[PDB]
Scaffold this active site. Structure first.
Site, mmCIF file in Angstrom:
data_model
loop_
_atom_site.group_PDB
_atom_site.id
_atom_site.type_symbol
_atom_site.label_atom_id
_atom_site.label_comp_id
_atom_site.label_asym_id
_atom_site.label_seq_id
_atom_site.Cartn_x
_atom_site.Cartn_y
_atom_site.Cartn_z
ATOM 1 N NE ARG C 61 7.695 118.073 -23.137
ATOM 2 C CZ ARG C 61 8.343 118.715 -24.103
ATOM 3 N NH1 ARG C 61 9.124 119.750 -23.810
ATOM 4 N NH2 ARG C 61 8.189 118.334 -25.368
ATOM 5 C CE1 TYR C 114 11.132 113.621 1.254
ATOM 6 C CE2 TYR C 114 12.017 114.131 -0.928
ATOM 7 C CZ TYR C 114 11.175 113.388 -0.113
ATOM 8 O OH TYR C 114 10.366 112.424 -0.662
ATOM 9 C CG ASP C 186 10.916 122.011 0.637
ATOM 10 O OD1 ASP C 186 11.446 120.900 0.419
ATOM 11 O OD2 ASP C 186 9.687 122.174 0.718
ATOM 12 C CE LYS C 211 5.436 114.556 0.615
ATOM 13 N NZ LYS C 211 6.801 114.958 0.946
#
Lengths: 398, 398, 398, 398
Positions: C61, C114, C186, C211
């Site tokens: 993690r 977004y 972004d 994406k």
């Protein structure tokens, strides 16, 4: 980390054998080598690899590190010198037979065999000049009698469907040992946790890891374990040149994951099977039960001598055969109607109305399959739920 | 669209053929059926699936839904009727040959063959009574003169190593059609994007999808495409019983992922190879170049006749021989020293110093292995970087 | 094994950066470290690992070897010092915003964002004492006027939906440098192949790797690239403590696989988008188009200063509004009606009748959501197939 | 097959709950939906999916079919209404708390917490206006006194480190009900198989599925189980907008595979731990031993009222302090020096010399961290092997 040589316990070795995290960046779980090719630092190194002078890799079909760990572990569990991972149980069987057999050779086979193994022998390698003969591997007099100077290998399963018929591995191995024959045993049903044919004299063992070893039915895989000499040949010929049955390192990893709970899963399968077999033994609707765990099992003594536990597979016959078997199967709600075995999910099959439904009573019968014989692969679900499913279905089969 | 229906272009079919998200919960990417067995709602449905009177599944080794999608897509790309996915390219070729040949039969082979298929033929099936004969598949007259009543199969690679020697597919196919024989073409190098043997008359094409089709070298897989009749047979005999070379649904999914960029990647492999080939041609260290894209290529016309593009593989000889080959290989920094091909990563190999390094110059010369021949699998890297790496390696070969 | 051997090209670095097979047993593709924990040889090594004075791993993690390779590769592609891999794009932005903002802090946002980023800002962190303010990132005067001593972060996408509105990144970075604010861009739409905001002055870039980066729609993933100091804070705080958006080593290896063909795919996406855009421009049903490649694009010049190619996304308004939009959308047969973008498969959506179908014409207009605007994520299929689809869809949209 | 939380049995539900093979082409193992987006048949269908009037997916960050099975199955095992799958235990903890708490809200915490949970509380949400206070959850008197109208949620682990301290779950639940606080318990150590907090009154349970649920240390994941109303909120805000800690369908599939042997693994973890705890308790090197299975365990009776078995975790204190722990830890051969727990492999750690080696006997003694405290995650290895390892290490600790 704890190696084998059979020093650490079985569970310890099934989890740690051959792997030291310290050797792989400390990764507790081995990284998966999902790559087809490996590179050389020098041309002289690659050459040394090909000449077997240097230890390394170059192409996953021949050898892959993730597969190597699985192979070393399985070898440890079975008590053999070397292992080999393949794309399926059939891949292990064919790669094995394809390299040990040549035209003119004879292969003595157990009376009954897995369908595809039978198909492979009779319509496959058998059609390429290899002689095949079925003998009762429990009858050491009949076997010794079938032995000829051309007998190169003796192959069989133990237990073998449909009645879980056993063979005298050590008895067979001793006869084959004096004749120079190679003994290979399909140890799929027992797994090295319940039976180790190599320790009883067998030269090689084959497994459909797709079953118990994986235990979760999400991969199809095969395993071969035996001497280095024999396994090397199968790797370099049967696997490499013939079949090309290469196991995905991804699948090899999922298999090793499954093997980590092997002893525990087999313990439950067997514990569950024993209770179901005994419940079935009390049913008036049941005519006969083939389960090594019942004291009335014809080969009870032999089974106890070769298997540590009676196994998770049960075959039994319903009085009033076909029809009762069909109604039973169709009424099941927890047990699944499917082929295969060794999954956490309980499976059931009735050849008379499923795989061999196309046959006629005569055909089927004159071929060994009873009209009311159903086989169960008892799962890991709660025994009362399983018993309740069988009870409900038994009432419906009426 | 979506592949079949109308007449979608290659790229369209490479990413959509056979799959409509609407039929699978709208999942854009098809769910992976990583399952060994499938269950039946009734014993009747199961029997029907076995008999083939019912469209379903029961065991992944015989057939799996993820593999079926890959098979149909590959069939579409090759212009064939049906496809089959296997654990490796060798699994695809052995599976095909094991079901098409029986002792007595003769198989006509290309003059040179992939090392493992050569070993399979001469040390595998060939040792089981099958007749083997090598003929120049470019020489249509010698091929016809070798045709016999026993000739069952004609098998070759086109282009074939180490010179990218081609075969007139439509030509050998017409002879095959006149004299019986089944034509199997190993289309690994070209992929269906650059060459479609089935459309030229071949009956079957085999692929080591481990190469260009996957494209990223993280998988070992094989493909067979051809008539439903021939594929059904290879599926139910060669794969099912004689090889067990089962492809993991995981790897099949990864392969379909790679095929989604097949046209783009092949376009770049070819463009990079052309520039590299033309560059090697002007270098004083290079004695001869084997690239279908160079106008001086012996079979330039036939190549341009059969292949849409010249491919991404290049072979060339160094005037310096083995020493020059070794020095060149050891000097590479971007190209990796390894066997295999068709990865995004550029690979290079020098047979004389790597695979056959232990051979004698005469022994190597006999097999057709040159002392200064090096094979290049031109990757997807920036051409500028590749030219630089090759340039300096060429200088280092002095 | 380049990527770093003297600033190799983009394609060479996207394939090899950070990895030398020779350091991992020669494995051409890096082995996947699908392990949660890592072991230490001594408690001393452990402490040094936790203390940061030791180069190692202890818990995935916080940091994992295969994720690290992806992080280093992405950093190289964006031209940043460090990278961080996360479970999703939202995990990347929330992890970033969570560590950089505290109650009282001010964050200036692009006029459009977004869907989930807006909700996270407005109904999430924004509800924990952090101040928000939306400003046109193209209007450097308005931005300057918006700066306050409380302005700690400047966040926007470029291009930004639904009109592909561009921001003057180098100009915004100028103002932020003066006021001491952090600029976070972004870069999902362009990818480091079409625009590298860090090279224009931005401090951090975030990506929904789900994406274009993955390019194959089979994973959800996020990436953060920026200075080592900033990334170290986001890793040790945003991720691991305030967000547990850990990326699976399996998905990371898949993302890296997809990145190996990023240049090739983006090239095709843009090339396909360009002809579709110009085709759309000649149709009378299309009253307005939002594509950076058309010289009539309002910010055509600025777009060309920051972007190497106009991108694979096209947005346009249909005369006929909602009605025509539904008709058009429902008629599509190759293009899939879905959300998301960056896949090999062409996607299309109509906000007014899909995600905002619930609102009223006024509520939508209020939110900048046009009635006839449809957005297309142009895929890798054959343009001829793509053109035919939209062509017939436009005729139905009438 | 057989789900229905509570009847069928636990093992049956852990294997079959929520999945009927018949609905998915008969696939025994559910197909893995490794896709990010989902397409619609019409826009009106997408609209209904966004308005909640249509069953169906659209984007895996919000919801995925594979994750949904994992979720439904976990909900059944815990006896809850709904479940949520996330990228890690921290993803579950943070997603839960980020949606439940806002500035001004107060949260009472158990005295000791998992490291990262503590950091998230104090340096994360804590710094955003949410008030915190640690109360002994075993002291109902203290808890009641600590309650205030601003207390929004009560959060704790049980057992909790470092002594395996228990909370009276039913006790705090009654108090919480009185005042109106939400009780969320981190049930990681026990698993729904050994303890079901929801049945004791808790409103939410969170898990680091990275541990026992997975059981094989190859994935990082978290789970949240609770009321539908609560989990829906944590899904639509906590995961969707504030964390983006999306679980990869591949990892969710591995989780479900691990859960299939949960009962068997736990049974063995506890049986092994029971034996080691009793051995340790009699050793002269051990000052203190913390194992719920010992009759001498302080909260033995309370533990047995909440847990079906004592668990696989054990902590003890070496008389020799930090020096004895270091020598002990360094002498371990089978046990691995590493953080984490719940793996088939035994793990051991000495906080004083590892994770808190930096600290001085300052706060170490202040946070309950004894200098000789060692925590063991007893694995599934052969107990005889584990005994010998601890025994030898015990001797070396002198």
């Amino acid at each position: 980390m704890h190696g084998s040589n059979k020093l650490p316990g079985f569970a310890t070795r099934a989890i740690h054998h051959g792997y030291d995290p310290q050797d792989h960046g400390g990764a507790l779980v081995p990284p998966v080598y999902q790559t087809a090719t490996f590179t050389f630092p020098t041309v002289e190194y690659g050459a040394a690899c090909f000449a077997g002078e240097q230890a390394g890799h170059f192409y996953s079909r021949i050898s892959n590190p993730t597969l190597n760990l699985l192979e070393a572990r399985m070898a440890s569990l079975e008590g053999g010198e070397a292992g080999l991972a393949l794309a399926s149980g059939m891949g292990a069987i064919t790669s094995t037979l394809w390299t040990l057999l040549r035209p003119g050779d004879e292969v003595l086979l157990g009376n009954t065999l897995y369908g595809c193994t039978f198909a492979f022998l009779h319509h496959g390698i058998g059609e390429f000049g290899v002689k095949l003969r079925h003998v009762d591997m429990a009858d050491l007099q009949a076997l010794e009698a079938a032995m000829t100077p051309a007998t190169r290998v003796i192959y069989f399963e133990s237990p073998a469907n449909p009645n879980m018929h056993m063979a005298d591995i050590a008895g067979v191995a001793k006869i084959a040992r004096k004749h120079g024959a190679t003994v290979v045993v399909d140890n799929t049903y027992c797994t090295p946790y319940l039976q180790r044919p190599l320790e009883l004299g067998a030269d090689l063992v084959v497994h459909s890891a797709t079953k118990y070893l994986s235990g979760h039915g999400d991969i199809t895989a095969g395993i071969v374990v035996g001497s280095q000499a024999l396994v090397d040949r199968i790797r370099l010929q049967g696997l490499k040149d013939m079949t090309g049955a290469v196991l995905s390192p991804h699948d090899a990893a999922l298999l090793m994951r499954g093997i980590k709970t092997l002893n525990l899963r087999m313990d439950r399968h067997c514990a569950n099977a024993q209770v179901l077999a005994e419940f079935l033994a009390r049913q008036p609707q049941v005519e006969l039960i083939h389960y090594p765990g019942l004291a009335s099992f014809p080969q009870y003594t032999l089974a106890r001598q070769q298997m540590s536990q009676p196994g998770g597979m049960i075959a039994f016959e319903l009085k009033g055969g076909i029809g009762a078997g069909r109604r039973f199967m169709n009424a099941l709600q927890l047990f699944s109607r499917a082929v295969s075995l060794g999954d956490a999910e309980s499976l059931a099959q009735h050849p008379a109305s499923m795989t061999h439904s196309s046959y006629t009573p005569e055909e089927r019968a004159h071929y060994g399959i009873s009209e009311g014989l159903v086989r169960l692969s008892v799962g890991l679900e709660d025994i009362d739920d399983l018993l309740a499913d069988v009870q409900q279905a038994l009432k419906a089969s009426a």
